[PDB]
Amino acid sequence: SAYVQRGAIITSDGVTLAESVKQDDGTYVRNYPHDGMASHTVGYISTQYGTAGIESSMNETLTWRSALYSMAGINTTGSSVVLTINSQMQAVAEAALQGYSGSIVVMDPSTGAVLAKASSPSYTHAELGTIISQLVDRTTQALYSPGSSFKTVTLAAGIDTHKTTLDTTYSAPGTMEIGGGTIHNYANEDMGTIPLREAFARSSNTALAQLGVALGADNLVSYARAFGYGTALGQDFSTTPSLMPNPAEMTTWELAWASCGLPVGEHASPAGPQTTVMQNAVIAAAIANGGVVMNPYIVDRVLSPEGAVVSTTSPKSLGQAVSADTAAQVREAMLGVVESGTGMGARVPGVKIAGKTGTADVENGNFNSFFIGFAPYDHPTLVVSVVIEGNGENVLGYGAQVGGRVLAQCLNIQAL
Ligand SMILES: *[C@@H](O)[C@@H](NC(=O)c1c(O)ccc2ccccc12)[C@@H]1N[C@@H](C(=O)O)C(C)(C)S1
C-alpha cells in the first residue's frame, strides 16, 4: 500500500504542490516543492495532527494480485488532482497576510471556483514532524462575528422584500432604544436623517438595526440561509456551517444587533450571525452574480497517471437568494462604501472596486476587521473576503486595505 505511488496535487497554473517520490526501499516519500504554500488546502494525513485538506478529502483518487505486495507498484498508481487555485493569486494573498493573523479567499463569482485561499499563521509540512493556532484553517473552520459586513444581507433582504430602497431616509442617531436595549453608532456619531445608501456607506448601526427590525426575525434568518447559512459550503472541501438562531427564539433587541452582524442572543439555538470567511465570500459572489449563489469548489479536475482527464468539476448553484434587480441595488450600495464611505482604503486608482467593511469585538477588548468585495464593478470577475484579527493590536480598517490590494494584484494577474 506504500509501494503504490500517490498522485500529485497541482495548481491550475501548473505548479506542483505535493508529489510522491519512490525510495529504493520500495516505499514512497511525500515531497512538497513549494513547502509553505497553501498549506491548509493541500493538507496532510498525520497520526498526531489528524487529516486535513485535499490530501485527506481526495485520498482515494490520490491513493488475485492484491495478495502479492511485490506486485503493488506495477499495478495501480494514484491519479493527480488539479486545483482551481492559481499560484500567483495565492502568493498575493499569502504576502498580504505576512505579520498578521487572519484569512483571505479569492473566488470567481460566476462559478464559485476558489482561486486563492490563505490562512495565517501557517506552517510548512516540514514542521509537522517537529512540534507545531497555526493548524486552524481560518478560511473555513473558524467562526467569527461578521460585524457590519453582514449588513450586506440585511440590505439585500430589505430591498428584495420591497420594504425599503436605497433612497429611503432613515434616522441615524448616535444612540437609540430598540427592544428595550441600546443600539449605538460607532463613537456614538449622530448622523441625523440620511438615505439608506449613505447609512450603508457610513455603516450606521442605528439605521441598519431599524431595517432589521422592520424585516423581522423570520425574514432575516430566511435570507441568511438563502445565501448559505446552515450549509457546509464546498463541493470538495469542508467548511463549518455559518450559524443563525431559531427565529422563534430571537428577541427584538437581539434582532437589532444581528442585523448589524453582532450575535447577542441567549437561548437554546446558537447566537448569530457567526460566519466563516468562505461564507462571506459566497455572499459577495452572489451579489456580484445577479443573486445566484454558487457552491464553491477547489478541484478543477482529476488526471489519470498518464494525463487523461478522468473527471471535471461542474459549478453548481445553491439557488437564487435575491432577484437580479435586488443584486444590482446592493452592488451599487457596495460601490458607495468604497467610493465615499468606510471602505476608501480599498480604492485602487483606475479600477472600480465595491465592497462592505466590518469590525467586531472579541475578548480582552481585541477586535477583528473584515472586508468583502468584488471587481471590476461593471462586470465582476473576482470576489475577495478577508479577516484581519486584532490580537494585541488595533487593526481598524485593515481588512479593506488588504482587500483592495489583493483585488488589484489579482486583476493584473488575470490580465496576463
Ligand atoms: C460595524 O461593524 C460597525 N461597528 C461597530 O460599531 C463596532 C462593533 O459593533 C464592535 C467592535 C468595534 C470595534 C472597533 C470599531 C467599531 C466596532 C460600524 N462598522 C465598522 C466597519 O468596519 O464597517 C466601522 C468601524 C465603520 S463602525
TrEMBL record:
Residues 6-81 form the Penicillin binding protein A dimerisation domain. Coiled coil: none annotated. It is found in: Membrane. Residues 102-408 form the Penicillin-binding protein transpeptidase domain. This is Peptidoglycan glycosyltransferase. The lineage of its organism: Bacteria, Bacillati, Actinomycetota, Coriobacteriia, Coriobacteriales. The chain holds residues 523 to 950 of 954 of the full protein.
